[PDB]
RNA sequence: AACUGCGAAUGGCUCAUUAAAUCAGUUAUCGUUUAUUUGAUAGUUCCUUUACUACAUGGUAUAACUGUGGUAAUUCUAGAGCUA
RNA sequence: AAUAACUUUUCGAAUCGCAUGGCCUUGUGCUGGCGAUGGUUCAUUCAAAUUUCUGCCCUAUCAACUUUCGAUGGUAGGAUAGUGGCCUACCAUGGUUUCAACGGGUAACGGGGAAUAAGGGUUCGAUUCCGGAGAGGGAGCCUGAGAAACGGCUACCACAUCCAAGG
């Protein structure tokens, strides 16, 4: 846990994204792992992006440890960081909230059931409820 | 079976997009346009495989719905559509401008131009016809069709046409001693001289071409667009101005080149 | 049976049920379109008229204009014909019907009533349903007001209220084919595009036989 | 919700039939159809051309909806009202 | 392209969204931007249907097949998106074959390919790609640009489900 490294390879400007896309090389020479959020921290820091317009997503240690290599992007105007990142990859910073949903077997067991009637429904609800009471 | 096909596989598309063999069952499957799609570029694949500007193709879509990328002048917002020979892609955002041209090796090469020579584009012509009304036109390359050219073009000239406004400008004879350009074949790429073209009868003419290292391969007419006159290209060039090296020097170019 | 009797001029509806044979068997052998005098219907039916327009058999089929000896009979249905909604389009069905004439075997029947005679109906000819809808198309609205072709009729719109708990707020249709300045500069703009395009063909046809005068000078 | 428009002819599965058949490479369409894509493309619409006809823009006819029902039953539906 | 005509008279925008600007003869005046949908014809693209040449395993324990209920060709018509015996009427007697026709078999979908590896070969290929065919069997069709479609429709049989027995 002496120090980390944090080296950014092969940087891409994306003016057409609002972005800035780079290979992110971490040489951790003891640490077991470098744990992205604190590199979301430090990569702030090198871009003055305030740990929301950064993301890191594909990270591999070297075998025989010591070195990682993963992706990285940098957002200007955090803004434009929510407009651009896939949902999923926002929910692991917290910026977006998990949506809840049943699953697909569920999902799609309601659409056949509801293909079934034919408009509101709560025209025939009203006539079956008579039979049903009577 | 029934009507036309809507996917295309991996292991089918056409191999100068250099898409690779796992990741992935299916191909862009390039939209109807102006260019065949076994000859012609998506432009999720010049945008996300040969650019980088994407890591997906979901953001492809991102980049294209917001009226960013133009092609021939006019902003298009599919993802597969089909971009081809001397196409004039331009990302205003970047402010680079491109024109698809092909590598000496098949390939479509990422070639950067100018603001100006993003104006203008060149077609070779298909046929030239008499439409209704008594108004002649011709056709090119990409399906353009403009009406009242001058009398004095005929069929596998070219063209140099605005893109602003579509019309024609100055063009291109079809004799010996202009430069070439071959489209197709196993000379994909290669850039020479008319020096001799056999006419045939009956079906598909051959055209003799020399290039400036005075090596000589024949083409199909149809392979073959002509560009200028030699020495004077009407467009900017790729890099080795197609010229077909063996395998042997570009082991010693590549060689030579790594280190110093 | 049965009865389903609806008066249209009110638009009420109400169904009754009579058990008595000699009241049911002056329905039998009619065909439905033909009208029936209720008077020997019931004692409070004197001077009313009746219109056989449908029902229904047994086992749910219903009856069919047109189709008469009546037994159930199947029948291929197509679209913008009764007793069958097409699931996709061009499809059409062989289902079961039942034939127009009036049997003994119907468990219900629909009826109108053509001509209101003496005597009244207290669930059907004093109470009124109103129509659920006003005109939304312009000439529509026009013509139920009597208005004329210059009439604005903008303002004289059926205007509904609704309420949450305490907001009266109103809401209105759309009026289409409504004559609106956007519509006139779309008309403006269509044909202006139509002659600035055809003197533009006009001129390059001209240049055009310029260049080939040029030519004839060789 | 429902009408309108598009799609559902792609995909995925299998190898039963099939021995000049399929298919492979190679041709032709001066022998044809082609939604969609792309580029072009449309001053003529009227009456023996004066009493002319809405062009500041014509007509009903239905869904959804309201209301009354049938059937043990199904993506079953009838009669009556309204409105694009 | 021109002439003379013909037509259950095809098309020639009674559609939608953001903007809201310029001129005086102050009228809800006259003009006026960007772009969505549609529309005739032509071209293009995605195709499709026909189509030329050559090429397929075992069998003579299959040597003569095909015409008359089209077999080979001609003329005219019908039909088709279109060519064509594709069908019809009339007419002629052709067409294929020991260089293997025709018939039979195949535990036969064809190809790219796989296995074995001196060379030459032998055996396999239902099956990651291309093409074809089919959706329990066989016909017939609606819609559409595109289907003889089967997660479309019209009745069967190896069949088979539900019940209030009517469906």
Known sequence: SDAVTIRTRKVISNPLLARKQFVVDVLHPNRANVSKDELREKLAEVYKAEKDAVSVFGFRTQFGGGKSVGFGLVYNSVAEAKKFEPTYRLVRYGLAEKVEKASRQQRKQKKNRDKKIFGTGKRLAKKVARRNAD | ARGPKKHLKRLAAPHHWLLDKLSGCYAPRPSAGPHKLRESLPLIVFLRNRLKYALNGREVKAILMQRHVKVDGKVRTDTTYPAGFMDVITLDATNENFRLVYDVKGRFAVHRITDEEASYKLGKVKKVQLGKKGVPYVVTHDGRTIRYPDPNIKVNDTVKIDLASGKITDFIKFDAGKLVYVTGGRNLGRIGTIVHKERHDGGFDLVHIKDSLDNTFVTRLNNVFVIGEQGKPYISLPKGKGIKLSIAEERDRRRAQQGL | ?218
């Open chain 3, 1 to 218: 049976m049965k009865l389903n009797i609806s008066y249209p001029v009110n638009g009420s509806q109400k169904t009754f049920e009579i058990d008595d044979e000699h009241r049911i068997r002056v329905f039998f052998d009619k065909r439905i379109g033909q009208e029936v005098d209720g008077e020997a219907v019931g004692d409070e039916f004197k001077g009313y008229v009746f219109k056989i327009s449908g029902g229904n058999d047994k086992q749910g089929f219903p009856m069919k204009q047109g189709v008469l000896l009546p037994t159930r009979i199947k029948l291929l249905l197509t679209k913008n014909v009764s007793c069958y909604r097409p699931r996709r389009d061009g499809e059409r069905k062989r289902k079961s019907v039942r034939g127009a004439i009036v049997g003994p075997d119907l468990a219900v029947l629909a009826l109108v009533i053509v001509k209101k005679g003496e005597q009244e109906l207290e669930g059907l000819t004093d109470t009124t349903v109103p129509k659920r809808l006003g005109p939304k198309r312009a000439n529509n609205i026009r013509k139920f007001f009597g208005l004329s072709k210059e009439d604005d009729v903008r303002d004289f719109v059926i205007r509904r209220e609704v309420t949450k708990g305490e907001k009266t707020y109103t809401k209105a249709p759309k009026i289409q084919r409504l004559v609106t300045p956007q519509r006139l500069q779309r008309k403006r703009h269509q044909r202006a595009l139509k002659v600035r395009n055809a003197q533009a063909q006009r001129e390059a046809a001209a240049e055009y036989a310029q260049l080939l005068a040029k030519r004839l000078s060789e």
